[PDB]
Amino acid sequence: RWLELGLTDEEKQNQLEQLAEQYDELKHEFEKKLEAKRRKITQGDDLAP
Amino acid sequence: MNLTELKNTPVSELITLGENMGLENLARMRKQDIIFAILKQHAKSGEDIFGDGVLEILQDGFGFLRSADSSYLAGPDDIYVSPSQIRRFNLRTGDTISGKIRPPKEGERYFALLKVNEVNFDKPENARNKILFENLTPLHANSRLRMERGNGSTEDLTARVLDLASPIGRGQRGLIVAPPKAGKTMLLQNIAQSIAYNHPDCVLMVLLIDERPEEVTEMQRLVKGEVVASTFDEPASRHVQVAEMVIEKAKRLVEHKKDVIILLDSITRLARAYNTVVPASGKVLTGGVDANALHRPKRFFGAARNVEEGGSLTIIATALIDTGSKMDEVIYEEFKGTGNMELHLSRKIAEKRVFPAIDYNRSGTRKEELLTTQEELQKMWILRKIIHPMGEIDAMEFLINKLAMTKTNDDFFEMMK
Amino acid sequence: MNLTELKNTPVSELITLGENMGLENLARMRKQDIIFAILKQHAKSGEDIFGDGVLEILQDGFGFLRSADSSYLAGPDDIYVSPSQIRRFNLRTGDTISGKIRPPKEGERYFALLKVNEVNFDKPENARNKILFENLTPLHANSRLRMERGNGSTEDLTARVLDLASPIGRGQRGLIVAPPKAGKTMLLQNIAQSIAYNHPDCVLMVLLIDERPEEVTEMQRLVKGEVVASTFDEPASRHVQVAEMVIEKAKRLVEHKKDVIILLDSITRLARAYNTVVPASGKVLTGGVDANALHRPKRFFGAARNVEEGGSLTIIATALIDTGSKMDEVIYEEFKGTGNMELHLSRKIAEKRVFPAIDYNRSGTRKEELLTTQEELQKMWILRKIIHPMGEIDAMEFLINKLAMTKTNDDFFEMMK
Ligand SMILES: Nc1ncnc2c1ncn2[C@@H]1O[C@H](COP(=O)(O)OP(=O)(O)O)[C@@H](O)[C@H]1O
Numbered sequence: 098r099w100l101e102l103g104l105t106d107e108e109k110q111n112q113l114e115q116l117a118e119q120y121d122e123l124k125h126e127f128e129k130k131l132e133a134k135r136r137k138i139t140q141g142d143d144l145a146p
Numbered sequence: 147m148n149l150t151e152l153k154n155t156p157v158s159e160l161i162t163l164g165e166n167m168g169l170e171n172l173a174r175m176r177k178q179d180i181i182f183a184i185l186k187q188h189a190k191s192g193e194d195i196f197g198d199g200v201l202e203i204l205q206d207g208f209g210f211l212r213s214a215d216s217s218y219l220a221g222p223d224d225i226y227v228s229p230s231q232i233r234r235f236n237l238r239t240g241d242t243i244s245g246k247i248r249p250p251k252e253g254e255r256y257f258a259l260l261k262v263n264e265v266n267f268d269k270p271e272n273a274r275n276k277i278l279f280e281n282l283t284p285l286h287a288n289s290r291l292r293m294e295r296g297n298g299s300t301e302d303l304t305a306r307v308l309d310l311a312s313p314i315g316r317g318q319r320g321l322i323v324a325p326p327k328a329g330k331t332m333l334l335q336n337i338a339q340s341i342a343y344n345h346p347d348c349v350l351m352v353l354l355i356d357e358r359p360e361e362v363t364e365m366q367r368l369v370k371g372e373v374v375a376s377t378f379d380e381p382a383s384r385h386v387q388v389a390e391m392v393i394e395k396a397k398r399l400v401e402h403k404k405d406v407i408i409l410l411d412s413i414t415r416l417a418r419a420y421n422t423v424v425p426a427s428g429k430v431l432t433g434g435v436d437a438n439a440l441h442r443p444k445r446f447f448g449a450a451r452n453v454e455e456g457g458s459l460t461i462i463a464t465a466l467i468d469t470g471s472k473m474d475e476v477i478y479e480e481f482k483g484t485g486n487m488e489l490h491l492s493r494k495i496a497e498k499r500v501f502p503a504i505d506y507n508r509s510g511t512r513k514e515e516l517l518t519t520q521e522e523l524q525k526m527w528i529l530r531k532i533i534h535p536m537g538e539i540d541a542m543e544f545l546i547n548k549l550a551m552t553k554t555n556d557d558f559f560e561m562m563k
Numbered sequence: 564m565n566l567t568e569l570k571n572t573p574v575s576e577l578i579t580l581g582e583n584m585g586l587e588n589l590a591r592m593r594k595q596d597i598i599f600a601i602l603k604q605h606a607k608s609g610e611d612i613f614g615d616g617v618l619e620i621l622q623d624g625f626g627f628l629r630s631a632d633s634s635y636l637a638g639p640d641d642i643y644v645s646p647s648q649i650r651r652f653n654l655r656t657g658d659t660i661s662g663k664i665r666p667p668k669e670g671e672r673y674f675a676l677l678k679v680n681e682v683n684f685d686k687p688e689n690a691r692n693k694i695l696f697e698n699l700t701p702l703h704a705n706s707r708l709r710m711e712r713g714n715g716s717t718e719d720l721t722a723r724v725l726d727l728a729s730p731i732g733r734g735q736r737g738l739i740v741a742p743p744k745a746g747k748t749m750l751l752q753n754i755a756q757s758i759a760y761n762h763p764d765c766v767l768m769v770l771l772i773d774e775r776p777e778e779v780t781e782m783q784r785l786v787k788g789e790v791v792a793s794t795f796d797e798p799a800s801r802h803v804q805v806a807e808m809v810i811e812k813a814k815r816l817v818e819h820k821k822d823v824i825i826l827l828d829s830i831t832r833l834a835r836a837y838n839t840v841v842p843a844s845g846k847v848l849t850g851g852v853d854a855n856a857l858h859r860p861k862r863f864f865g866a867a868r869n870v871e872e873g874g875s876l877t878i879i880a881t882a883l884i885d886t887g888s889k890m891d892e893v894i895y896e897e898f899k900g901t902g903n904m905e906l907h908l909s910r911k912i913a914e915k916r917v918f919p920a921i922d923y924n925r926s927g928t929r930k931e932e933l934l935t936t937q938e939e940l941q942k943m944w945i946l947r948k949i950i951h952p953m954g955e956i957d958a959m960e961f962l963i964n965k966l967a968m969t970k971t972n973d974d975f976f977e978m979m980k
């Protein structure tokens with residue numbers, strides 16, 4: 098639960114930012130697929146007139 | 147680039163800038179919609195945009211970066227904030243955040259903030275390790291905030307009178323009890339101008355709730371600082387939104403050890419909106435107000451306090467009387483006991499074209515000895531002793547005549563001699 | 564360990580202690596949330612924590628150990644008390660319980676108290692075999708509680724005047740009838756300080772209901788003893804909660820043969836909250852108060868009494884007048900006849916900067932002969948005889964001048980000679 102550190106900016110901050118961006122993208126994509134499947138399975142289906 | 151950097155200027159420069167960007171006719175859509183399209187094109191140029199805004203947290207956990215010029219309301223340029231930032235830094239409501247943003251891909255909603263670069267005009271390291279607002283130690287007004295301008299204008303008296311009636315300081319909780327058609331507008335105007343001119347160190351945050359749009363335009367481009375307002379164009383929902391958002395911004399700015407003046411008018415319409423947006427408890431009070439309708443207004447009112455560690459929050463919320471019904475008066479009552487600073491204005495004298503008509507009798511300040519020096523306090527005590535035994539009209543005409551016959555307040559002391 | 568042992572100190576020591584415990588960033592969460600996390604880690608170290616708190620009983624039968632520093636309110640460190648303890652000892656509301664507690668397993672709520680080790684600063688055997696509070700025999704004030712400090716301060720007079728106007732003793736029921744902006748705050752402040760300094764044997768329990776948070780902070784760290792308060796930050800629900808909880812704590816402490824002074828301000832806001840939280844009976848009284856809205860306030864007011872067996876409960880609840888409406892005055896009326904001790908303060912003299920402005924005429928005490936010796940009673944009778952035939956201003960200036968010209972009260976008797 099700790100990505101948060103800072104020291105030796107020149108490279109350490111560059112790679113820590115890259116990994117933070119990767120983590121955020123992963124979490125956002127996963128929650129997006131989550132909500133998509135949610136709204137798909139909760140969307141009622143047509144039955145008949 | 148920054149949205150406010152495109153917002154300080156009218157729609158005309160936005161139109162020509164969009165024509166520079168080579169897009170569809172911009173003047174047709176709204177100017178904030180123009181800004182949305184313009185930032186979309188700027189992001190299409192292959193660059194990371196730099197955005198800023200104060201945070202609004204919904205139930206889902208993500209955030210919105212509401213902009214200052216958009217009156218802290220919902221807009222197409224509200225930057226989406228992924229929950230991962232709330233997991234790392236846990237930025238609360240009102241935290242002014244500036245950082246890198248990306249365009250919305252299709253089927254998305256708005257711009258997404260990638261990495262924060264500035265947290266409340268400070269490094270992000272102070273955001274996680276910081277003492278909270280409701281966790282502070284509230285105190286009284288220690289430092290005095292003088293109000294007189296110093297060059298002797300006609301409405302400069304409207305500030306001097308306060309310094310002569312009851313002082314105002316940092317962390318105080320002020321009420322302005324006045325009927326309609328009394329002179330509250332110009333009063334808060336010159337109050338803000340005097341605070342800005344004489345004390346440019348503090349952060350002036352003027353607030354306006356449910357007034358005329360012409361009044362909003364007159365307030366925004368007359369005083370120093372940010373002017374967020376919500377007129378009758380917005381329902382009680384957006385009213386309570388902007389109110390809680392500015393109050394949380396003030397909370398965060400005091401957490402960062404800064405002084406915030408919140409001039410709000412009026413508190414009664416805010417209370418009406420609150421009573422409109424509370425669940426019914428199957429019972430009504432005297433005047434037509436729900437039981438729990440006062441809890442959140444009381445929270446918003448008591449958010450103001452003076453801190454031991456750093457910063458202050460001083461709110462001056464105007465109370466409205468002479469509305470004919472009870473409920474508003476009820477609000478006023480429920481608000482005299484919570485605020486430690488009262489200031490009462492006269493309409494019976496205002497109809498006589500006698501301005502400014504401040505009630506010198508029922509005005510006062512609790513712990514006012516911390517708001518003024520020793521001998522000045524003695525002289526103010528003696529001056530109120532002189533003002534007391536004469537009639538209302540007597541005191542008020544004496545005030546206006548002998549203060550317009552003076553220029554500054556210490557000059558007034560040295561002339562009363 | 565003990566929660567209050569971590570609560571007497573600010574959030575800074577809690578932060579460094581949590582850093583010693585090796586947890587997530589503590590400053591981000593609230594300081595009481597910090598204490599919750601810290602006690603969770605301390606329990607993770609493989610030790611049984613020792614907690615304490617006063618009991619609050621819900622409808623389900625279990626209990627909560629509300630802490631003193633948390634203003635007897637809901638918190639994450641409220642120790643859960645299984646019903647089995649209420650089956651064995653039947654600990655009622657307000658019983659200060661200290662014992663062994665365990666951490667909450669997941670899906671649980673809070674810490675659970677395993678075994679009680681201390682019941683109201685006494686052995687648990689006295690808890691089951693004990694005579695109850697409403698089961699006692701109420702009596703009058705037999706022992707006199709002197710109020711003068713003894714070194715002659717300016718506000719020391721504010722105590723002496725009481726000893727000169729109407730004595731105060733154990734088990735009495737006192738009312739303070741005063742308008743706003745009269746001098747009740749400093750009065751109860753020096754009253755508490757004098758009770759603590761001159762009579763450190765009794766348990767000082769100052770109470771504050773719906774005031775400024777700065778006032779709460781000024782009261783907590785100025786006087787001797789526990790200071791529980793509930794400002795406007797809490798609705799009528801938490802108001803009545805803290806009120807009934809402190810009153811039940813006082814009931815239990817008197818059951819344990821101890822004296823409890825309850826300085827409450829104000830009783831009118833408590834009555835407003837009560838009228839807010841009562842079911843509607845389809846009818847309203849004069850002023851806008853429900854019919855059964857006074858039953859529970861009357862119970863809370865009459866909880867004070869002097870006991871034959873041991874202990875006393877003396878409440879001094881301030882009544883508020885000059886509020887413009889009727890209902891508050893109605894409360895005052897319904898409260899003059901139930902209390903056997905009246906004390907009235909003057910605002911018409913307070914506006915003249917004449918402090919302290921106590922109404923010497925309408926002040927009095929029922930069965931006041933048990934509150935003072937024989938010849939001192941004769942001299943007080945003669946002194947009131949002297950004070951009567953002169954005007955209000957006359958009596959008040961004579962009081963203030965000739966008592967500031969004195970140092971103590973018996974010295975005042977020996978100077979009037
Ligand atoms: N200090 C002042 N000097 C001159 N006129 C004043 C002053 N204060 C108020 N007025 C008069 O009050 C009118 C505006 O009232 P307004 O402030 O809108 O009412 P309210 O007091 O209810 O806000 C103006 O026409 C102006 O002439």
Ligand SMILES: Nc1ncnc2c1ncn2[C@@H]1O[C@H](COP(=O)(O)OP(=O)(O)O)[C@@H](O)[C@H]1O
Nearest residue numbers: 513718721742743744745746747748749918919
């Ligand atoms: N014993 C006293 N000596 C000097 N000033 C006093 C005294 N008692 C009250 N005051 C004045 O009363 C003011 C505070 O009154 P307060 O207690 O808030 O009114 P209320 O009685 O409505 O609670 C202070 O500004 C103080 O100057």
Ligand code: BEF
Nearest residue numbers: 325326327328330
């Ligand atoms: F008429 Be005022 F603006 F209340």
Ligand code: BEF
Nearest residue numbers: 742743744747883
């Ligand atoms: F305003 Be006071 F405390 F009655």
Ligand SMILES: [Mg+2]
Nearest residue numbers: 327329330331
């Ligand atoms: Mg106006």
Ligand SMILES: [Mg+2]
Nearest residue numbers: 746747748828
């Ligand atoms: Mg008071």
